[PDB]
Design a protein around this motif. Sequence first.
Motif, PDB file in Angstrom:
ATOM      1  N   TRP A   1       0.787  -1.211   0.000  1.00  0.00           N
ATOM      2  CA  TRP A   1       0.000   0.000   0.000  1.00  0.00           C
ATOM      3  C   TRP A   1       0.839   1.291   0.000  1.00  0.00           C
ATOM      4  CZ3 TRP A   1      -5.638  -0.128   1.348  1.00  0.00           C
ATOM      5  CH2 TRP A   1      -6.102  -1.431   1.659  1.00  0.00           C
ATOM      6  N   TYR A   2       0.666   2.237  -0.973  1.00  0.00           N
ATOM      7  CA  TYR A   2       1.345   3.505  -0.827  1.00  0.00           C
ATOM      8  C   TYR A   2       0.703   4.513  -1.810  1.00  0.00           C
ATOM      9  CZ  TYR A   2       5.385   6.419   0.292  1.00  0.00           C
ATOM     10  OH  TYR A   2       6.246   7.303   0.973  1.00  0.00           O
ATOM     11  N   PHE A   3       1.090   5.768  -1.586  1.00  0.00           N
ATOM     12  CA  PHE A   3       0.737   6.769  -2.575  1.00  0.00           C
ATOM     13  C   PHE A   3       1.359   6.456  -3.946  1.00  0.00           C
ATOM     14  CE2 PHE A   3       0.454   8.642   1.649  1.00  0.00           C
ATOM     15  CZ  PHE A   3      -0.724   9.441   1.624  1.00  0.00           C
ATOM     16  N   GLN A   4       1.008   7.336  -4.934  1.00  0.00           N
ATOM     17  CA  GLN A   4       1.543   7.201  -6.300  1.00  0.00           C
ATOM     18  C   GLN A   4       2.900   7.875  -6.296  1.00  0.00           C
ATOM     19  OE1 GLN A   4      -1.828   8.468  -8.746  1.00  0.00           O
ATOM     20  NE2 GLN A   4      -2.714   6.419  -8.535  1.00  0.00           N
TER      21      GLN A   4
ATOM     22  N   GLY B   1       9.445   7.214  -3.207  1.00  0.00           N
ATOM     23  CA  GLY B   1       9.562   7.630  -1.757  1.00  0.00           C
ATOM     24  C   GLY B   1       9.959   6.387  -0.937  1.00  0.00           C
ATOM     25  N   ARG B   2       9.310   6.223   0.193  1.00  0.00           N
ATOM     26  CA  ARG B   2       9.719   5.157   1.183  1.00  0.00           C
ATOM     27  C   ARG B   2       9.362   3.762   0.653  1.00  0.00           C
ATOM     28  NH1 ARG B   2      13.595   6.571   4.227  1.00  0.00           N
ATOM     29  NH2 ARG B   2      13.075   4.821   5.749  1.00  0.00           N
ATOM     30  N   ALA B   3       8.392   3.647  -0.286  1.00  0.00           N
ATOM     31  CA  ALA B   3       7.907   2.308  -0.699  1.00  0.00           C
ATOM     32  C   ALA B   3       8.937   1.641  -1.688  1.00  0.00           C
ATOM     33  CB  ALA B   3       6.556   2.401  -1.441  1.00  0.00           C
TER      34      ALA B   3
ATOM     35  N   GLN C   1      -8.156   9.690  -2.533  1.00  0.00           N
ATOM     36  CA  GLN C   1      -8.625   8.452  -1.917  1.00  0.00           C
ATOM     37  C   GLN C   1      -8.079   8.320  -0.495  1.00  0.00           C
ATOM     38  OE1 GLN C   1      -6.985   6.013  -5.435  1.00  0.00           O
ATOM     39  NE2 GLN C   1      -8.600   4.720  -4.575  1.00  0.00           N
ATOM     40  N   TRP C   2      -6.941   8.938  -0.214  1.00  0.00           N
ATOM     41  CA  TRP C   2      -6.264   8.671   1.069  1.00  0.00           C
ATOM     42  C   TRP C   2      -7.132   8.899   2.286  1.00  0.00           C
ATOM     43  CZ3 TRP C   2      -3.280   5.916   3.784  1.00  0.00           C
ATOM     44  CH2 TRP C   2      -2.644   6.379   4.990  1.00  0.00           C
ATOM     45  N   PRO C   3      -7.912  10.003   2.354  1.00  0.00           N
ATOM     46  CA  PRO C   3      -8.621  10.226   3.644  1.00  0.00           C
ATOM     47  C   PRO C   3      -9.621   9.122   3.947  1.00  0.00           C
ATOM     48  CG  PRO C   3      -8.590  12.235   2.337  1.00  0.00           C
ATOM     49  CD  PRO C   3      -8.110  11.139   1.404  1.00  0.00           C
TER      50      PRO C   3
ATOM     51  N   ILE D   1      -9.029   5.899   3.169  1.00  0.00           N
ATOM     52  CA  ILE D   1      -8.214   4.657   3.374  1.00  0.00           C
ATOM     53  C   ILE D   1      -7.543   4.781   4.758  1.00  0.00           C
ATOM     54  CG2 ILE D   1      -6.047   3.574   2.758  1.00  0.00           C
ATOM     55  CD1 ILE D   1      -6.792   4.282  -0.292  1.00  0.00           C
ATOM     56  N   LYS D   2      -6.940   5.936   4.998  1.00  0.00           N
ATOM     57  CA  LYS D   2      -6.212   6.212   6.251  1.00  0.00           C
ATOM     58  C   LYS D   2      -6.841   5.637   7.570  1.00  0.00           C
ATOM     59  CE  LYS D   2      -4.260   9.995   8.825  1.00  0.00           C
ATOM     60  NZ  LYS D   2      -2.768   9.564   8.954  1.00  0.00           N
ATOM     61  N   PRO D   3      -8.166   5.861   7.775  1.00  0.00           N
ATOM     62  CA  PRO D   3      -8.675   5.457   9.147  1.00  0.00           C
ATOM     63  C   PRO D   3      -8.835   3.937   9.248  1.00  0.00           C
ATOM     64  CG  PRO D   3     -10.067   7.188   8.034  1.00  0.00           C
ATOM     65  CD  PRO D   3      -9.202   6.505   6.953  1.00  0.00           C
TER      66      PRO D   3
ATOM     67  N   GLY E   1      -2.444   4.550  10.732  1.00  0.00           N
ATOM     68  CA  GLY E   1      -2.873   5.664   9.857  1.00  0.00           C
ATOM     69  C   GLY E   1      -1.734   6.141   8.888  1.00  0.00           C
ATOM     70  N   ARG E   2      -0.806   5.249   8.483  1.00  0.00           N
ATOM     71  CA  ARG E   2       0.340   5.642   7.687  1.00  0.00           C
ATOM     72  C   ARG E   2       0.745   4.488   6.762  1.00  0.00           C
ATOM     73  NH1 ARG E   2       3.693  10.345   8.058  1.00  0.00           N
ATOM     74  NH2 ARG E   2       5.226   9.178   9.333  1.00  0.00           N
ATOM     75  N   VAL E   3       1.414   4.820   5.670  1.00  0.00           N
ATOM     76  CA  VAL E   3       1.967   3.857   4.711  1.00  0.00           C
ATOM     77  C   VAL E   3       3.500   4.159   4.492  1.00  0.00           C
ATOM     78  CG1 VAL E   3      -0.219   3.371   3.680  1.00  0.00           C
ATOM     79  CG2 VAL E   3       1.046   5.494   2.941  1.00  0.00           C
ATOM     80  N   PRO E   4       4.232   3.225   3.909  1.00  0.00           N
ATOM     81  CA  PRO E   4       3.823   1.937   3.274  1.00  0.00           C
ATOM     82  C   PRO E   4       3.307   0.940   4.333  1.00  0.00           C
ATOM     83  CG  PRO E   4       6.139   2.589   2.645  1.00  0.00           C
ATOM     84  CD  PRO E   4       5.689   3.580   3.755  1.00  0.00           C
ATOM     85  N   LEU E   5       2.487  -0.007   3.854  1.00  0.00           N
ATOM     86  CA  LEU E   5       2.031  -1.146   4.642  1.00  0.00           C
ATOM     87  C   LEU E   5       2.168  -2.306   3.605  1.00  0.00           C
ATOM     88  CD1 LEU E   5       0.494  -1.678   7.300  1.00  0.00           C
ATOM     89  CD2 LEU E   5      -1.593  -1.701   5.869  1.00  0.00           C
TER      90      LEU E   5
ATOM     91  N   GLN F   1       4.253  -2.788   8.995  1.00  0.00           N
ATOM     92  CA  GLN F   1       4.467  -1.345   8.966  1.00  0.00           C
ATOM     93  C   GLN F   1       5.966  -1.044   8.884  1.00  0.00           C
ATOM     94  OE1 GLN F   1       2.618  -1.052  12.900  1.00  0.00           O
ATOM     95  NE2 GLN F   1       1.370   0.586  12.088  1.00  0.00           N
ATOM     96  N   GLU F   2       6.288   0.220   8.581  1.00  0.00           N
ATOM     97  CA  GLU F   2       7.671   0.829   8.671  1.00  0.00           C
ATOM     98  C   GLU F   2       8.495   0.323   7.507  1.00  0.00           C
ATOM     99  OE1 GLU F   2       8.151   3.354  10.640  1.00  0.00           O
ATOM    100  OE2 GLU F   2      10.160   3.611   9.648  1.00  0.00           O
ATOM    101  N   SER F   3       8.685   1.164   6.456  1.00  0.00           N
ATOM    102  CA  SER F   3       9.230   0.688   5.183  1.00  0.00           C
ATOM    103  C   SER F   3      10.509  -0.066   5.325  1.00  0.00           C
ATOM    104  CB  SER F   3       9.414   1.910   4.228  1.00  0.00           C
ATOM    105  OG  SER F   3      10.457   2.726   4.685  1.00  0.00           O
ATOM    106  N   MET F   4      11.502   0.413   6.056  1.00  0.00           N
ATOM    107  CA  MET F   4      12.803  -0.319   5.981  1.00  0.00           C
ATOM    108  C   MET F   4      12.844  -1.481   7.052  1.00  0.00           C
ATOM    109  SD  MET F   4      14.551   0.545   3.438  1.00  0.00           S
ATOM    110  CE  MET F   4      16.282   0.179   3.904  1.00  0.00           C
TER     111      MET F   4
HETATM  112  N1  LIG Z   1       9.459   6.010   8.599  1.00  0.00           N
HETATM  113  C1  LIG Z   1       8.137   5.653   7.909  1.00  0.00           C
HETATM  114  C2  LIG Z   1       7.663   6.896   7.178  1.00  0.00           C
HETATM  115  C3  LIG Z   1       6.204   6.614   6.660  1.00  0.00           C
HETATM  116  C4  LIG Z   1       5.547   7.837   6.038  1.00  0.00           C
HETATM  117  O1  LIG Z   1       6.266   8.979   5.983  1.00  0.00           O
HETATM  118  N2  LIG Z   1       4.361   7.805   5.554  1.00  0.00           N
HETATM  119  C5  LIG Z   1       3.727   9.016   4.925  1.00  0.00           C
HETATM  120  C6  LIG Z   1       3.802   8.728   3.414  1.00  0.00           C
HETATM  121  S1  LIG Z   1       3.549  10.134   2.356  1.00  0.00           S
HETATM  122  C7  LIG Z   1       2.270   8.957   5.170  1.00  0.00           C
HETATM  123  O2  LIG Z   1       1.708   7.795   5.279  1.00  0.00           O
HETATM  124  N3  LIG Z   1       1.595  10.054   5.257  1.00  0.00           N
HETATM  125  C8  LIG Z   1       0.126  10.013   5.384  1.00  0.00           C
HETATM  126  C9  LIG Z   1      -0.413  10.589   6.620  1.00  0.00           C
HETATM  127  O3  LIG Z   1       0.420  10.666   7.557  1.00  0.00           O
HETATM  128  O4  LIG Z   1      -1.644  10.852   6.646  1.00  0.00           O
HETATM  129  C10 LIG Z   1       8.393   4.598   6.892  1.00  0.00           C
HETATM  130  O5  LIG Z   1       9.488   4.588   6.203  1.00  0.00           O
HETATM  131  O6  LIG Z   1       7.468   3.735   6.692  1.00  0.00           O
END
Ligand SMILES: N[C@@H](CCC(=O)N[C@@H](CS)C(=O)NCC(=O)O)C(=O)O
Length: 210
Positions: free
Chosen positions: A8-11, A14-16, A39-41, A43-45, A50-54, A68-71
């Motif tokens: 799961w990630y944005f287009q 980046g981290r994905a 679409q994010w708002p 998907i987020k909840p 509440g964050r990606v990548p997943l 969770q946590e890309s690396m």
């Molecule tokens: N250290 C985290 C950083 C994750 C991260 O920055 N996610 C941003 C991606 S643009 C995000 O999900 N933002 C959406 C939000 O916080 O609503 C990782 O590498 O997974």
Amino acid sequence: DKQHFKLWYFQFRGRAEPIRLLLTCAGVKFEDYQFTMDQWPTIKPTLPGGRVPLLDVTGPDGKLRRYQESMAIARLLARQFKMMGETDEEYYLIERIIGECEDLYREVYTIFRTPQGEKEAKIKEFKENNGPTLLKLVSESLESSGGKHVAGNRITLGDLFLFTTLTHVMETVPGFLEQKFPKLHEFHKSLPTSCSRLSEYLKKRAKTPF
Ligand SMILES: N[C@@H](CCC(=O)N[C@@H](CS)C(=O)NCC(=O)O)C(=O)O
Ligand SMILES: [Br-]
Ligand SMILES: [Br-]
Ligand SMILES: [Br-]
């Protein structure tokens, strides 16, 4: 195989991206779900934290585990795929380059996020200051291990995360790597020749702004 991976990630790369490259190089098919900002708002909840990548992994038992946590995701996969080093020494070399590239990634992401606007000042600061200092470290690290691979003589997560971070320098500070750190530019040209799955993937990948 009830087996399935969905990322799961944005287009956005980046981290994905290191996870996409690792699954590509390992030959693991996965659903690369890149959703739009609109679409994010909604998907987020629904996602943990509440964050990606997943990365959702459906294992052979048919059961779903959500990571969770890309690396952290990339290191767990890399270990599974024997791309995290075969000796403690190799493991340290990978880790050393990933630490140094985390620093470099933050610098170029800050330029990418800077208004249009005020970017040129931050680029000049980078070229004169933390750029050379971080890129010298990264160059010395790669040289110490022979110029082609961060560790061992095969592709590892260290290589892939170096590759994606050098892509960001090349796109955000154009010409700088090519002129000032030719060995790192040579690495960026060479690495895809070390996994043909990588090269085909990069050929066909969508363009994104970072
Ligand atoms: N250290 C985290 C950083 C994750 C991260 O920055 N996610 C941003 C991606 S643009 C995000 O999900 N933002 C959406 C939000 O916080 O609503 C990782 O590498 O997974
Ligand atoms: Br890349
Ligand atoms: Br990238
Ligand atoms: Br230059």
